[PDB]
Amino acid sequence: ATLKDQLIYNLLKEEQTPQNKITVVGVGAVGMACAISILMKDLADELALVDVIEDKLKGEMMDLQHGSLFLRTPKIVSGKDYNVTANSKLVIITAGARQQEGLNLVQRNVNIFKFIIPNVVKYSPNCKLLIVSNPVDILTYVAWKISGFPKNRVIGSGCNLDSARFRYLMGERLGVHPLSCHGWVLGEHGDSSVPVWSGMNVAGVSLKTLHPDLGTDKDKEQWKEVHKQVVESAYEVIKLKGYTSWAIGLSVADLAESIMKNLRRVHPVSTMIKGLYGIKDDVFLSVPCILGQNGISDLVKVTLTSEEEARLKKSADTLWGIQKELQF
Amino acid sequence: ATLKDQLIYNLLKEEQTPQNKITVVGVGAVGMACAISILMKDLADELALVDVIEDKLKGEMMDLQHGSLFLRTPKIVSGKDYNVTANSKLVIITAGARQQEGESRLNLVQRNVNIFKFIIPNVVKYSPNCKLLIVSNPVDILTYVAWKISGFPKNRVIGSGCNLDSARFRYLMGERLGVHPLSCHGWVLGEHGDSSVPVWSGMNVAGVSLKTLHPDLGTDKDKEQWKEVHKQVVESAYEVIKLKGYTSWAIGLSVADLAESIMKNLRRVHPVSTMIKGLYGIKDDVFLSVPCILGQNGISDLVKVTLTSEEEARLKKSADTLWGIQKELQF
Amino acid sequence: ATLKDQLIYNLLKEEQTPQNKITVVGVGAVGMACAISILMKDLADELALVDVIEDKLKGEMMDLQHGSLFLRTPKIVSGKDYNVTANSKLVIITAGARQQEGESRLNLVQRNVNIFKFIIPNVVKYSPNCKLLIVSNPVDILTYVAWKISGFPKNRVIGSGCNLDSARFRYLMGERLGVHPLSCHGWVLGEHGDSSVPVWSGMNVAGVSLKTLHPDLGTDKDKEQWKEVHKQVVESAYEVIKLKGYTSWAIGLSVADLAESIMKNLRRVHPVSTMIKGLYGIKDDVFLSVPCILGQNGISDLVKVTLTSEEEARLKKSADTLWGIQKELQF
Amino acid sequence: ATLKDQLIYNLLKEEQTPQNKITVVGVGAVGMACAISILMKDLADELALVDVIEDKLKGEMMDLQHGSLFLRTPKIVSGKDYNVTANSKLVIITAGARQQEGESRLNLVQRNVNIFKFIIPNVVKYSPNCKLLIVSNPVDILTYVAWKISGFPKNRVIGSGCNLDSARFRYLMGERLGVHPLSCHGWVLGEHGDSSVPVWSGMNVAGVSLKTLHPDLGTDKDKEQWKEVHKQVVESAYEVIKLKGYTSWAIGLSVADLAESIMKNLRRVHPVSTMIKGLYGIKDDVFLSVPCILGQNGISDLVKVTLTSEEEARLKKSADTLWGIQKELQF
Ligand SMILES: NC(=O)c1ccc[n+]([C@@H]2O[C@H](COP(=O)([O-])OP(=O)(O)OC[C@H]3O[C@@H](n4cnc5c(N)ncnc54)[C@H](O)[C@@H]3O)[C@@H](O)[C@H]2O)c1
Ligand SMILES: NC(=O)c1ccc[n+]([C@@H]2O[C@H](COP(=O)([O-])OP(=O)(O)OC[C@H]3O[C@@H](n4cnc5c(N)ncnc54)[C@H](O)[C@@H]3O)[C@@H](O)[C@H]2O)c1
Ligand SMILES: NC(=O)c1ccc[n+]([C@@H]2O[C@H](COP(=O)([O-])OP(=O)(O)OC[C@H]3O[C@@H](n4cnc5c(N)ncnc54)[C@H](O)[C@@H]3O)[C@@H](O)[C@H]2O)c1
Ligand SMILES: NC(=O)c1ccc[n+]([C@@H]2O[C@H](COP(=O)([O-])OP(=O)(O)OC[C@H]3O[C@@H](n4cnc5c(N)ncnc54)[C@H](O)[C@@H]3O)[C@@H](O)[C@H]2O)c1
Ligand SMILES: O=C1N[C@@](c2ccc(N3CCOCC3)cc2)(c2ccsc2)CC(O)=C1Sc1ccccc1Cl
Ligand SMILES: O=C1N[C@@](c2ccc(N3CCOCC3)cc2)(c2ccsc2)CC(O)=C1Sc1ccccc1Cl
Ligand SMILES: O=C1N[C@@](c2ccc(N3CCOCC3)cc2)(c2ccsc2)CC(O)=C1Sc1ccccc1Cl
Ligand SMILES: O=C1N[C@@](c2ccc(N3CCOCC3)cc2)(c2ccsc2)CC(O)=C1Sc1ccccc1Cl
Incomplete structure (x- = not known):
C-alpha cells in the first residue's frame, strides 16, 4: 500500500548497537571542529552530540546531517539527555565554562564535569575519555576521580x-x-x-x-x-x-x-x-x-x-x- | 654555517608555480567550512585565503597552519592583496553582505554586486585561466554578475546552485x-x-x-x-x-x-x-x-x-x- | 631488565578481543586483491588470512606485514588453523578449484562443495556471529551451499553476485x-x-x-x-x-x-x-x-x-x- | 542524432591534457602493485601502463578499467608505444629481466642496461620534465644508468633504494x-x-x-x-x-x-x-x-x-x- 512497502521488502528490523560510536560533549568551536574532523576521517559509524544549549545543538546536528551525502557516517544524533551517548567507544569532552568571571574558571569546570562524567559512565562504562577542556591536566584528574575508570581509559589532550x-x-x-x-x-x-x-x-x-x-x-x-x-x-x-x-x-x-x-x-x-x-x-x-x-x-x-x-x-x-x- | 646548512644540503632552490592551487574569497562561516573540507580531502597543494577583515583572516590562516602536521597541504597563504591568489586552478567566492530588517532584495543584490565589482577583476588579474565557483547569495544572479565582469566563457563560471x-x-x-x-x-x-x-x-x-x-x-x-x-x-x-x-x-x-x-x-x-x-x-x-x-x-x-x-x-x-x-x- | 622494559613502562598487558576483524579464506589472485583493497580503505583493525597452501600463505602475510608502515591495520595474521579467524565480523570466501578441460558443470561445482564442507563449519566454529561474503564460482550456487551448511539466517549469507x-x-x-x-x-x-x-x-x-x-x-x-x-x-x-x-x-x-x-x-x-x-x-x-x-x-x-x-x-x-x-x- | 546527443548537450569540445599523469613501465608483480597503490591513494588523474608483453598489458589495463567505479582516476591507458606516456609528472620503471640459471650477476646487469637503453630515451622523448623513479634491480646501478642516458639533473633521477x-x-x-x-x-x-x-x-x-x-x-x-x-x-x-x-x-x-x-x-x-x-x-x-x-x-x-x-x-x-x-x- 505505502511506497516504502511497495519499493522495499524488509527481511529483519532487528535493533543493533553501534560498533564504532563517538560522543562529543560540548558543541562549541572546539567540539564542532573535532566532530567534522572525525566524520571526514571516517572514524565513526555513529556520532553523538551533547550540550546544555538546546537550540545551537539541534542546529549543528542538522547542518552535519544535511552533508551526510558527502560523509561515510550513517547516524548523527544529538540531545540534552545522555541516552543518545549509549554504547559509545570514545567520549570527547570539550565542555567548558565561559571565560567571564561571575567560583573561578578551574572551579566552574570541575562542577560542569560533576554531572557530565557520571552521566557518560552511566550509558558508556567501557569507553575511553578524551579530555580537551582547560586546565586539561587538572580536569583529566577530575574525570579520572569521578569516573573511577582505570588510569589508561582516562586520556587528556595535553x-x-x-x-x-x-x-x-x-x-x-x-x-x-x-x-x-x-x-x-x-x-x-x-x-x-x-x-x-x-x-x-x-x-x-x-x-x-x-x-x-x-x-x-x-x-x-x-x-x-x-x-x-x-x-x-x-x-x-x-x-x-x-x-x-x-x-x-x-x-x-x-x-x-x-x-x-x-x-x-x-x-x-x-x-x-x-x-x-x-x-x-x-x-x-x-x-x-x-x-x-x-x-x-x-x-x-x-x-x-x-x-x-x-x-x-x-x-x-x-x-x-x-x-x-x-x-x- | 647555520644549523639548516649543517643538517640539510640543498640541490636546487628553484621556486616553481603551484600546480593545484585553490583560492577562497571570504573567510566567513561558509568560507572556512569550504577551506577545511578541501584540506581534509587533499585537493590542493596550496590554499590561498582572501578577506576584507585583516585580523580574522590572519587568525584563520594561523589556525589552519598549526594543524599542517595532520594535513597533506604544504602551503596555506592569506592576505588583503590578491597577489597571494596568483596561478589558481579554482577560485571559490563565498564573500557576501548580511541583509537587514529594513532592506530591499534589489538593494542586497546591488551591495553584493559592488563587492563582486572589486573581487572578480582582482581574481582574473592574477588567475586568468581559473574556474569561478560562486557560493554567495543570490547564487543564480551573482554567477551572472561574475560571468559579465570576468568576461570568462560560460563553462569557466560555475555557480553552487x-x-x-x-x-x-x-x-x-x-x-x-x-x-x-x-x-x-x-x-x-x-x-x-x-x-x-x-x-x-x-x-x-x-x-x-x-x-x-x-x-x-x-x-x-x-x-x-x-x-x-x-x-x-x-x-x-x-x-x-x-x-x-x-x-x-x-x-x-x-x-x-x-x-x-x-x-x-x-x-x-x-x-x-x-x-x-x-x-x-x-x-x-x-x-x-x-x-x-x-x-x-x-x-x-x-x-x-x-x-x-x-x-x-x-x-x-x-x-x-x-x-x-x-x-x-x-x- | 630488557630495552622494552627500560624504554616503555606498561600500564596493562590485557589484550582485547578483535573488534573490526576481517577473514579472507583463499589467498589466490582474488583473495589477495580483496585483502589489499580492504587494508588500503582502512576497514579492519585485524586481518586474518587462511589457505590450504601454507608456503604461499606465509609469504603473502609477510609481504603485507612489511608494508604495515603505509597501512592503518595493526594486526595481520595467517594460518592453516581457523583459530586465527576467531571473532571475525566479516568472512570473505574466495577459495575455489580451477576449471578443467572436458569438465561437467555438476562436476566442478561438487569439487567446490567439498571445499566448502570443510571451510563453512570451521568458520562458524570461531566466528558464529559473522557475515559470510561468497566470491567463489558458481557464486549463486555456492552462496546457497554456504547458507545450508552454516545454518545462518539468509541475511548473514551474502553472495558477490x-x-x-x-x-x-x-x-x-x-x-x-x-x-x-x-x-x-x-x-x-x-x-x-x-x-x-x-x-x-x-x-x-x-x-x-x-x-x-x-x-x-x-x-x-x-x-x-x-x-x-x-x-x-x-x-x-x-x-x-x-x-x-x-x-x-x-x-x-x-x-x-x-x-x-x-x-x-x-x-x-x-x-x-x-x-x-x-x-x-x-x-x-x-x-x-x-x-x-x-x-x-x-x-x-x-x-x-x-x-x-x-x-x-x-x-x-x-x-x-x-x-x-x-x-x-x-x- | 544519438542517445549521447539526446541525453547530453555539449558546451565545448576542448581536448584535455592530464595535469597529474603517472606512467608505470613494467606490468609485472611490482608494476601492478605500484599501479593499484597509486589509484587507491588518488594520486593521478591519468595512469599510463607500458610493457613489452602486449597480451598481459591489455588484460591488466582492462582489469583496472573495470574497477573504475570504485576509483577516482578517470583515465587508464596502455600500449607498446610510449606516445601513451606523453606529459607524465612521474615515471616509475619496474621493468627488468630475471637472473637465468647459467647467468652471472654481471650478465644480468648488462641485460637490464640494454632494457634501459630502450626505455629511458623513449620516456624522455614524450615526458622531458618528468621525475624518474627506478625500482628495478640493481636499483643503485640502474638509477645511475637512467641518469646517464636521460641526461636529466641528479634531482629528477630518484631510485627506490x-x-x-x-x-x-x-x-x-x-x-x-x-x-x-x-x-x-x-x-x-x-x-x-x-x-x-x-x-x-x-x-x-x-x-x-x-x-x-x-x-x-x-x-x-x-x-x-x-x-x-x-x-x-x-x-x-x-x-x-x-x-x-x-x-x-x-x-x-x-x-x-x-x-x-x-x-x-x-x-x-x-x-x-x-x-x-x-x-x-x-x-x-x-x-x-x-x-x-x-x-x-x-x-x-x-x-x-x-x-x-x-x-x-x-x-x-x-x-x-x-x-x-x-x-x-x-x-
Ligand atoms: N586542550 C587544548 O589544547 C585546547 C585547545 C583549545 C581549546 N581548548 C579548550 O576547549 C574548551 C572549549 O573551547 P570552545 O571554543 O569549544 O569554547 P565554547 O565556550 O564555545 O564551548 C564550550 C561548550 O561547552 C558547553 N557546555 C557547558 N556546560 C556544559 C555541560 N554541563 N554539558 C555539556 N556541554 C556543556 C557550552 O554550551 C559550550 O557549547 C575550553 O575549555 C578551551 O580551553 C583546549
Ligand atoms: N549557495 C548556497 O547554497 C549557500 C549556502 C549557505 C550560504 N551561502 C552564502 O554564503 C555567503 C556567506 O555566508 P557566510 O556564513 O560565510 O557569511 P559571513 O557574512 O560570515 O561571510 C562573508 C564574508 O565575506 C567577507 N567579505 C565581504 N566583502 C568582501 C570582499 N570585498 N572581499 C573579500 N571578502 C569579503 C566578509 O569579511 C565575511 O568574512 C552568503 O551570501 C550566503 O548566502 C550560500
Ligand atoms: N564472483 C565473481 O564475480 C568472481 C570474479 C572473479 C573470480 N571469482 C572466483 O574467485 C575464485 C578464486 O579465484 P582466484 O583467482 O583467487 O583463483 P585461485 O585458484 O588462484 O585461488 C583459489 C585459492 O583457494 C585456495 N583454497 C583451495 N581450497 C581451499 C580450502 N579448502 N581452504 C582454503 N583455501 C583453499 C587455493 O589454495 C587457492 O589459493 C574462483 O572460484 C573464481 O571463479 C569470482
Ligand atoms: N627496489 C626494490 O626494493 C625492489 C623490490 C622488489 C622488486 N624489485 C625489482 O622489480 C623488478 C621487477 O619485479 P617484478 O616482480 O615486477 O618482475 P617481473 O619479471 O614479473 O616484471 C618485469 C616486467 O618488465 C617487463 N619488461 C621487460 N622488458 C621491458 C621493456 N624493454 N619495456 C617495458 N617493460 C619491459 C616484463 O614484460 C615484465 O612484465 C625486478 O628487477 C626486481 O628486482 C625491486
Ligand atoms: O589550550 C589552549 N587554549 C586557548 C584558548 C583560549 C581561550 C578560549 N576561549 C575564549 C573564547 O571563548 C571560547 C573559549 C579557548 C581556547 C588559549 C590561547 C592562549 S591562552 C589559552 C587556545 C590555545 O591556542 C590553546 S593551546 C596553548 C595555549 C597557551 C599556550 C600554549 C598553547 Cl599550545
Ligand atoms: O542559500 C542559503 N542561505 C541560507 C543563509 C545563509 C547565510 C545567512 N547569513 C545571514 C546571517 O549572517 C550569517 C549568514 C542566512 C541564510 C538561508 C537559509 C534560509 S533562507 C537562506 C542558508 C541556507 O541554508 C541556504 S540553502 C536554502 C535556502 C532557502 C531555501 C532552501 C535552501 Cl536549500
Ligand atoms: O566470475 C567470473 N569468473 C571469471 C574467471 C574465470 C576463470 C578463472 N580462473 C581461476 C584461476 O585459474 C585460472 C582460471 C578466474 C575467473 C570468468 C571469466 C570468463 S567466464 C568466468 C572472471 C570474471 O571476470 C568473472 S565475472 C563474469 C564472468 C562471465 C561473464 C560476466 C562476468 Cl561479469
Ligand atoms: O630488492 C629486492 N629484490 C627481491 C626480489 C625481487 C624480485 C625477484 N624476481 C621477481 C620474479 O621473477 C624472479 C625475480 C626476485 C627477488 C629479492 C629478494 C631476495 S634478494 C632480492 C625482493 C626483495 O624483497 C627485495 S628488497 C631486499 C632484498 C635483499 C635484502 C634486503 C632487502 Cl630489503
Missing part, C-alpha cells in the same frame, strides 16, 4: 597541540614537512610546557648533536624562540579571531584514529605520572604514550635533563596544590 | 526510505532556494522510478504526501538559521565535492547554476541549476532533463524574475 | 556517454555471469531514463547497438582470462565496496546474490542478485524491481537452471 | 617494542639489499635514542641481540621469494608513499638512492640511499647524516663495489 605547533615552526625554519620534523613538547599543557631539545631530530640526526647551543641563551640562531613562538601564536589566534578550532580539532581526530583503529602510535598526551620523574602525587602530565583500543596501554620513559626534570616537578607541585584543595 | 538543495533532499528521501542518501537519487533544479523545482520523474532508488510505482508522487492529492520532502528542505534551511544563525558544514562539504570533480577531472554530474539561455523556452542571459558534467574545463557538458509542463513553467517564471532584477543592475 | 557485472556495465555505459561510472546508473541482476539480466528501465544518468529517450534500448533492432554494452561485459570477462589468465583488481575493489557498507553500516544498495524465494515467480531455495540494502546485519532489506515479462522469464529460467544443480548436490 | 629496507626494519623494530612502525624511527642507508647500513644512532621512539639507553645496540656484545633485527630484514626478503616467488605489496605501497610526496610536493624525508659523489669520501659517480627531502622538483635537498667510522667505511666500500661493475658497463 601537549598534543603544543607539539603540533612546535613541529610546524621547526618545519618552516628547516623547510621540511612537520611529519619529518620530530619534536616533543612535554609536561603541563600551555605556558609551562617543556620542549625536549635532545629528542628534536630530522631523519634520526639529533639537532642538539649538530648544534649544542640548541635551546640555550648563547644560541646565535636562537632556537629557544621556536617554543616561545608556540605560546605567542596561541595568544595571537585568540587576539585575532577569538578562539582556536581547526588545529585542536585535527589533533583530537589524530588521537581518535589511534584509539578507534588500535594503531599503537606514540602521542604527547596527559596521563598519570605517579612513579616517574620523582613525582609521588596523583597528577596528570603529557608524556609520550602508546595509544590503542585499551587507551594508554604503555608510556615512553623520556631521559630528561636536570632543568627539564625540575620544570616537570615544579608543574607537578603547582598542580597537586590545586587538586588537593578540590572538593567532590 | 541547487547542489545543497539536492543534498538536503536526498537526505530526507534517505531517512524516509531508510536507505543511504548515496543510494537515494533525487534532483532539485532551477533557481536555488524557495523557487527550486524537484524533478519527481528522476526520483529513484536502484533505478526503479518512484513516480512509476506511485503516480501521485509530488502531486497535491498524494496520500503519503511526498511533496512534504521538498517542503521540509526549505523549512530545514530556515530552521538551521533560527537555531544556530548560519549554515556551514553542509555547504562546505558540497563545495568540496564540486572541487573534487573539477580538480581531478572526474566528469561526474552535479546540480549547478549555469547559462540556461536557449532551453525550456528561455531567451534571457539567466543562470539556473541543471545537471552538469564537471571536469578540468569547468562545465564541459549539460544533461537535457525531460521536464513536465508545470516544471517548465516554474523554470520560465524564475528566469523572468531573475532577469527582472538583472536588467535593474548597476555595473 | 552481479556486483562486478554492474561495475563493468557502468564503466562501458560511462565510456560511451563520456561520464564517470558513478554518474552512470545501471543495474544488472539475476544469475552472475552469462545469464545476467540488464535492467534497461533502470538505466539512467541524472535521473533521466535512457529507455524513455531511446525506446529501442536493449533490443537487437537498435541502430546504436546499446545491447552490445551488456554483450561487451560478458566478452571482456572472457578477454581478461585470455590475455592475463585471471581477474583480480576489479573484483577485489568491488568486494571492499560491499565490505565498506557492512563494516560501517552504510545501508547502501548493492547488486548481491540473496535468497529470492517468493519474488518473481521463484519457488525454489535459489540465490539471485537483486538490489539489497547492506548494513551491520548483512542484508536487512531488498529492493522490489519492476521487471518486464522478458526479464522475469530470464530470472525464472536461471532459477530452474540453478535448482537443477542444487537438488543434485551431495553434502 | 633503501625505502623498503627501512620499511621492513621499522616493522621488526615495531614488533619487538610493541609500537606502530610509524612511531618506530629507524634508518637503513647505503646500497639497497645485503650491503645496507643500519644507522643505530638514529634509531629512536619519541625522540629518545635507543643507542643511548642501550650502548651495545647493533654490536655483537649485545645481550638482547638487536643486530638480528637488520639480519632478519635480509632473511625475510629471501624468505618471501622462497615462500611465494616474488615481492609485490610491500614495495608497491612504498613506491606510492614516495609518489605521494612527489605528486603533492609534501617535502617529507625518505631513504632513496641518489648521487652520493662528494659525500662520505666518495669520488665516483655512484647512487646510494641517504635521507632526501622529496617534492615536486624531485630531490630538492639531502640530509647530512653523522655516520660512525665503520658506517662511513661500509658506505665507501659499497660505492667502490658498485663502481667496479659500473665502469665495465657498455651503453
